[PDB]
Design a protein around this ligand. Structure first.
Ligand SMILES: CC(=O)SCCNC(=O)CCNC(=O)[C@H](O)C(C)(C)COP(=O)(O)OP(=O)(O)OC[C@H]1O[C@@H](n2cnc3c(N)ncnc32)[C@H](O)[C@@H]1OP(=O)(O)O
Ligand SMILES: CC(=O)SCCNC(=O)CCNC(=O)[C@H](O)C(C)(C)COP(=O)(O)OP(=O)(O)OC[C@H]1O[C@@H](n2cnc3c(N)ncnc32)[C@H](O)[C@@H]1OP(=O)(O)O
Ligand SMILES: Nc1ncnc2c1ncn2[C@@H]1O[C@H](COP(=O)(O)OP(=O)(O)O)[C@@H](O)[C@H]1O
Ligand SMILES: [Mg+2]
Lengths: 472, 95, 191, 95
């Protein structure tokens, strides 16, 4: 019944869904803001339409009514939201399903249950999956202080709608707890409107484990193993690996089983990610992401399962094991290990601020074990400050984790992006580290390793020679 | 007979309108077909662009079909070489 | 029944699909064997019964042979190059980039593309996708012929033989391509 | 203390020759270091290229190391824009 799909996103995820749609034989519709007119994803689709005319480009990509209007006038049967803009938005999915278009996502009750952190924690408690010992709902500042008294420091302040570590603060004493509560309140009203701050127990050096969940309309729910995303800077993911090579297979199986049984209790559909906090052979639920994730690529590499294709086919109502063709849970293969690196415009010698400018050189590596999901990184592309800093996702996969590390080091040295600064030297430093190589990296690994921020001087002799030749 | 001859001359099977216009204006229709094979549907360009081309640093948008719009920008016009050719530095669709 | 013909005492062009379905880096193992290392002790390959079969893979070699010109190797200036990516796609590009002047001296190969998947049908679908997503302008390629071969039911069933191309004239029917960016730029330049 | 101050001023630990040259010619050595950071080792260029730059359609080869030779061709010099900047269309190493 589906013949045409719109992607309400941009960048590399739009191209990823376009490639999946072309493999599934469907037509593709792109949307783009005026400031995103030179994006690759605009020209990778059968039809492209300008959206959000006159708005800011981020607000243009959040123009819900314009997106449904474009999808209706283009004859698109469905809308894939991708991630990061309206994938977790309850209002957008509600309007999409009210317009008669198929929403490639979970159900509305899944969206508004897993959107807010305290309701997701309540659902996990109903599924008896253990979580961080925290407040039973959004407490006040005084209640947060009371929790800091009875359960004792360390505690962590977290907002119930925070994203990307925005509404999340840390506290060590009483006054810093007040400051963190005030800052989380300001960030919650500023970006999300309502402040619903809770307080959770802080764990010393945890391991961030994410489990990928696929569920269909018939109720078959499987897990595509797990991902280790512990390597983070300021609670933002830097390098993600799959599977958790630093953990025992039985413990990973327990984490995966808890995730799939949580999703079975909530009756989850489509692709989803369950985030878990691992500390010395016990796990705690944090959130469920009701969308495809950025790091789904390494899960596809280690399992062989096309996550976006299965997402679209589940949105078609197809059976997980009969029509899509996925095997049983015990038959899901583990094809080696994979590592994902996000090459961004963040300058590690400038406090990881996003550099802007014109890319004058782009060379991408290839070969065995290398997967590229490029965004907008071609030569001549003018990097704008409007959108996110991502240039190209690169994934290296191999039978052994050591060979994956070696391939990713080769890739990061083979990559050449000139004109804008990149986080490539930081990624090289992290890859060379023995904690990451052993796979026992924690969430505090980057913040407690100052040697990651020592960068060798690069000659860059081609750029300087061309500059002098132009000068003379 | 005319339709088979035209299907030989042009690279496809013509419609009735193409056959009848080939009857009245044979060389004009064949020259039009050659210009279609060389320059494409120039009817979609706007008239100042159609008659005058592009200036330096000009941005034009050519809607070639529904949902497809070519973003064309002329960045530089190269000097003519010894063979008389000029290299024109376009930015088509960002590239 | 099977018959020997010859042994190629070197790495092959199509080693890529073998290392995709096995996971075993053939060139790396070549160098490590030339270092005198042991296959299972130092290189680390498992025993023969433990060599994996990770789905199926397809290699297509995109060349400058023009199928509408008797597969003669076209030469000229490459003015457009867009390469696909994503899940299941492997690229081993030769000299194929924007601005590269294809010379008649060397081999006609532009880029080797390999698609791999758990199922052969998914590999075929991915290869059709990447053959349509590939954009090389300025020189003719064998991409329309590869698209025709990938579309054929004799190929997709796995039952193709060495006479399949020579006995299927429908592989040499090529749809007309509009190429409207090139023609528009040509008219703009002319005016 | 001079060596430590130079290690502050230039982005690396200097040699004895660099320290002693910084003592004799303080501003001149710092200007040389700034030009090294901006233009690189221009001593590797040939003298007509060093003094006059590059002609249109000229091909030069710069050996920056043993086994590393930069192939540089100036294809086109762009007209200056309103900010006074020119775009120079180089072909470095085939690209
Ligand atoms: C992400 C994937 O899975 S890609 C799989 C293949 N599908 C696509 O590429 C969708 C985009 N469509 C196209 O590129 C082409 O129209 C094709 C491949 C379908 C037909 O090929 P052609 O006839 O030779 O080109 P066509 O005349 O139709 O289009 C002319 C130009 O408009 C470009 N174009 C294509 N889609 C759009 C668009 N939505 N908006 C603006 N320009 C577009 C084409 O890239 C082409 O430019 P090019 O010279 O760099 O290739
Ligand atoms: C195939 C693989 O496995 S890639 C692994 C390493 N990557 C490589 O590219 C190996 C070649 N070496 C290089 O490119 C560089 O010397 C590096 C990466 C080691 C150091 O990078 P930089 O310090 O920033 O640039 P460097 O001053 O050394 O070289 C200047 C230019 O000479 C180029 N160059 C590099 N090797 C050669 C060569 N053998 N011949 C001619 N030019 C060369 C570089 O590409 C560079 O041009 P660029 O601006 O486009 O990148
Ligand atoms: N209570 C806690 N104690 C210690 N570390 C935590 C705690 N809660 C979260 N973290 C770390 O901080 C990160 C929070 O990111 P997350 O909340 O998942 O971002 P988002 O809100 O965008 O989903 C996690 O990766 C986790 O490792
Ligand atoms: Mg989270």
């Amino acid at each position: 019944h589906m013949k045409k799909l719109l992607v309400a996103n941009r960048g590399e995820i739009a191209v990823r869904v376009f490639r999946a749609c072309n493999e599934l034989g469907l037509s593709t519709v792109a949307v783009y803001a005026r400031e995103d007119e030179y994006s690759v994803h605009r020209f990778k689709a059968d039809e492209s339409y300008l959206i959000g005319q006159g708005k800011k480009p981020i607000d243009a990509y959040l123009d819900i009514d314009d997106i449904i209007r474009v999808a209706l006038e283009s004859g698109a049967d469905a809308i894939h939201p991708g991630y990061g803009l309206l994938s977790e938005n309850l209002e957008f999915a509600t309007k999409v399903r009210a317009a008669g278009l198929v929403f490639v996502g979970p159900e509305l009750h899944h969206l508004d249950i897993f959107g807010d952190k305290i309701k997701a924690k309540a659902a996990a408690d109903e599924a008896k999956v253990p979580g961080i010992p925290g407040t039973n709902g959004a407490v006040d500042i005084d209640g947060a202080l009371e929790f800091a008294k009875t359960y004792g420091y360390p505690v962590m302040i977290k907002a119930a709608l925070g994203g990307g570590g925005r509404g999340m603060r840390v506290a060590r004493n009483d006054a810093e707890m007040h400051d963190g509560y005030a800052r989380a309140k300001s960030e919650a009203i500023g970006a999300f409107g309502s402040g619903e701050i809770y307080v959770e127990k802080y764990i010393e050096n945890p391991k961030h484990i994410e489990v990928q969940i696929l569920g269909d309309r018939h109720g078959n729910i499987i897990h595509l193993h797990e991902r280790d995303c512990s390597v983070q800077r300021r609670n933002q993911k830097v390098i993600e690996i799959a599977p958790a090579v630093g953990l025992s297979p039985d413990f990973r199986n327990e984490i995966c089983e808890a995730a799939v049984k949580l999703c079975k209790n909530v009756g989850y559909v489509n692709a989803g990610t369950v985030e878990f906090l691992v500390k010395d052979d016990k796990f705690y639920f944090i959130e469920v992401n009701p969308r495809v994730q950025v790091e789904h690529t390494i899960t596809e590499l280690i399992t062989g399962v096309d996550i976006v294709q299965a997402q679209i086919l589940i949105a078609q109502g197809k059976d997980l094991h009969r029509e899509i063709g996925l095997p049983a849970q015990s038959e899901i293969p583990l094809l080696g290990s994979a590592i994902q690196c996000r090459i961004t415009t963040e300058d590690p010698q400038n406090g990881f601020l996003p550099d802007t400018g014109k890319i004058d050189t782009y060379r991408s590596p290839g070969g065995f074990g290398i997967r590229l999901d490029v965004g907008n990184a071609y030569a001549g592309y003018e990097v704008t400050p409007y959108f996110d800093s991502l240039l190209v996702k690169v994934c290296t996969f191999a039978n052994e984790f050591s060979d994956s590390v070696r391939k990713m080091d080769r890739v990061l040295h083979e990559f050449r992006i000139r004109g804008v600064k990149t986080n490539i030297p930081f990624l090289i430093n992290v890859i060379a580290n023995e904690n990451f190589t052993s796979g026992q990296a924690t969430t505090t690994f980057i913040d407690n390793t100052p040697s990651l921020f020592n960068f060798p001087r690069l000659r860059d002799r081609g750029t300087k020679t061309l500059h002098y030749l132009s000068m003379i | 007979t005319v339709k088979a001859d035209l299907e030989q001359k042009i690279g496809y099977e013509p419609g009735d309108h193409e056959v009848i216009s080939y009857i009245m204006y044979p060389q004009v229709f064949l020259d039009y077909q050659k210009m279609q094979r060389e320059f494409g549907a120039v009817t979609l360009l706007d008239t100042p662009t159609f008659l005058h081309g592009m200036r330096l640093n000009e941005k034009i948008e050519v809607q070639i079909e529904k949902g497809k719009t070519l973003s064309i920008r002329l960045d530089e016009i190269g000097e003519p070489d010894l063979a008389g050719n000029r290299v024109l530095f376009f930015n088509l669709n960002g590239q």
